[model samples]
Target: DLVKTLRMNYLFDFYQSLLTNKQRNYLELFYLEDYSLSEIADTFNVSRQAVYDNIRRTGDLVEDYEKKLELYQKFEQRREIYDEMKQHLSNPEQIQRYIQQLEDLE
Candidate 1:
């Protein structure tokens, strides 16, 4: 589904520095650029299976990094707090609580 695609895009943004240039290009092409596996294979002079395998493995590696580092998890928490603060703009106390939660995150 598109939710998975969206999460992958975010994960790539957070963890791409840990990936090889080849893996980064594959993810950018397939997920961001919307290229098909066959198209990526053709562009890279590899088989479709090779492209698929690389992308799949890269996905696993990024997930592993997130599990260990939790950069994405903290980001989601911060976003949740910000959304709540936005909705409670008139309530200084509630906004202060949200700010405390954000500080606890770091």
Candidate 2:
């Protein structure tokens, strides 16, 4: 699950590019920290639904980013290669072959 496991150190910066300040914070708090709605609402001094809406709209924004930039597509594509390599990584010769094959990826 590339979508679940993806973690770039510059993740915040990437999310920052697609979201507003409030949205960015909400996502960080909700997705990254896994905060409860009341906790997030309390932190933001807003209603739970408001926090939910922010997170929802931020999802739309990320969809827009994925459609516009194809980042999600690329991430999935590269991740397949990574996983393929990893599955064969225990064998030195096969790992070398898979790694060499990685150069053909778009």
Candidate 3:
């Protein structure tokens, strides 16, 4: 469940601009706002299948983009390193490792 949530959150953040307005809105509501398929469909005046299919297709597309680009992967790696540094608040090695990890992104 955490994996699904993290994937959705990262995909939406990294590739939302590539989605149609409807796809983006549906994903926002379904994933971020925790709306049900029926609720999203009703809000959009569409059938439940329409909303489900749109979200399914959009999620697939974002995954494809992620596979090709690795933007989301890199973002997670970078953030993980940053969080590790925070966990080691008083350590110079953690700061250096964090900075090194950031540089690795490029």
The candidate that achieves the highest lDDT relative to the unseen native structure: 1
Model 1 per-residue lDDT tens digits across residues 1-106: 2234778989999999999998899888988899888899999999988988888888889999999999999999999888889999999899888999999997
Report the poorest 10 consecutive residues by lDDT, candidate 2: 1-10
What's the lDDT of the predicted structure labeled candidate 2?
0.67
TM-score of each: 0.87, 0.63, 0.75
Model 1 residue 59 CA deviation in Å: 0.8
For candidate 3, the lDDT comes to 0.84
**TM-score: model 3 vs. ground truth:** 0.75
Lowest summed lDDT across 10 adjacent residues in model 3 is found at 1-10
Q: Count clashes in each candidate, considering only residues at least 3 apart in sequence or on different chains.
A: 0, 0, 0
Candidate 3 per-residue lDDT over residues 45-88, each given as its tens digit: 99988887888888888889999999988988877887788899
**Runs in model 1 lying further than 4 Å from the true structure:** 1-4
Q: What is the Cα-based lDDT of residue 17 in candidate 3?
A: 96
Best to worst by TM-score, what's the order? 1, 3, 2
Q: Find the candidate with the highest TM-score and give its number.
A: 1
